[PDB]
Amino acid sequence: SNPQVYMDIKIGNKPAGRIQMLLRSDVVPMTAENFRCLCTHEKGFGFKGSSFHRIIPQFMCQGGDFTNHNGTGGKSIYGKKFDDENFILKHTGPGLLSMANSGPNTNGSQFFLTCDKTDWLDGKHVVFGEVTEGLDVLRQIEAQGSKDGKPKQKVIIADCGEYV
């Protein structure tokens, strides 16, 4: 049954609160499992201490690049990259989890949290989960965005894990 995970967010030197997310293992099991493991660090690496390096107001907050911290890095639990499982889940509104990529079948660890309906990404990025608690914390992340995506203050995943 669908995993639930959390990230505790720190903005600048200040704790912002916790985002809780439901992962859609029923629809995209490989994609959900990757993100789950990256929250728990059970495969030896993951999101803790990494940043949201690209934040665009009214669009999305992107993170998961825990190797290069700039959108060029990251890795999945399966290797550097894995296939797009399917595009069943659509970018219908804010608070959705979706995989960042560099073209078809290039999923690694980078992901974004949507801040509005982003339907122009449908069929291009794999949606795999949703925020169940802490939409307000996501809005605090978004508040640090700029049009060119540069964060105004550092946004860090201070802690993360699974409810299990």
Residue numbers in the entry: 138 to 301
What does the paper say about this structure?
Cyclophilins are peptidyl-prolyl isomerases (PPIases: EC 5.2.1.8) and are characterized by their ability to catalyze the interconversion of cis and trans isomers of proline. In order to understand the molecular basis of these results, we sought structural coverage of the entire human cyclophilin enzymatic class. We determined crystal structures of seven human PPIase domains—PPIC, PPIE, PPIG, PPWD1, PPIL2, NKTR, and SDCCAG-10. All cyclophilins share a common fold architecture consisting of eight antiparallel β sheets and two α-helices that pack against the sheets. The active site of the cyclophilin family includes the invariant catalytic arginine (Arg55) and a highly conserved mixture of hydrophobic, aromatic, and polar residues including Phe60, Met61, Gln63, Ala101, Phe113, Trp121, Leu122, and His126.
Even for the isoforms that have been tested in vitro for their substrate preferences, there has been little or no correlation with later discovery of in vivo substrate sequences. Clues in some cases may be derived from the identity of other domains expressed in tandem with the cyclophilin domain; for instance, the RRM domain previously mentioned implies an RNA targeting function for PPIE and PPIL4, and likewise the U-box motif of PPIL2 implies involvement in ubiquitin conjugation pathways. However, data were collected for the remaining 13 isoforms, and binding to CsA, CsC, or CsD was noted for six isoforms published previously (PPIA, PPIB, PPIC, PPIE, PPIL1, and PPWD1). Additionally, the NMR-based assay does not require substrates to contain chemical modifications, and can be used to measure effects of amino acid substitutions at regions distal to the target proline not measurable by other methods. We detected binding and turnover for at least one of the tetrapeptide substrates tested for PPIA, PPIB, PPIC, PPID, PPIE, PPIF, PPIG, PPIH, PPIL1, PPWD1, and NKTR. For instance, the residue that is at position 103 in PPIA varies from alanine in about half of the cyclophilin isoforms to a serine in PPIE, PPIH, and PPIL2; an arginine in PPIG and NKTR; lysine in PPIL6; asparagine in PPIL3 and PPIL4; and glutamine in RANBP2. The division between “deleted” β1-β2 loops and “full-length” β1-β2 loops follows a phylogram distribution of PPIase domains, with the more conserved isoforms relative to PPIA (PPIB, PPIC, PPID, PPIE, PPIF, PPIG, PPIH, PPIL6, NKTR, and RanBP2) encoding full-length loops and the more divergent members by sequence (PPIL1, PPIL2, PPIL3, PPIL4, SDCCAG-10, and PPWD1) encoding deleted β1-β2 loops. There are three distinct classes of conformations adopted by this loop: the PPIA α1-β3 loop family, which includes PPIA, PPIB, PPIC, PPIE, and PPIF; a shorter version of the loop represented by the structures of PPIL1, PPIL2, PPIL3, PPIL4, SDCCAG-10, and PPWD1; and a longer version found in PPID, PPIG, PPIH, PPIL6, and NKTR.
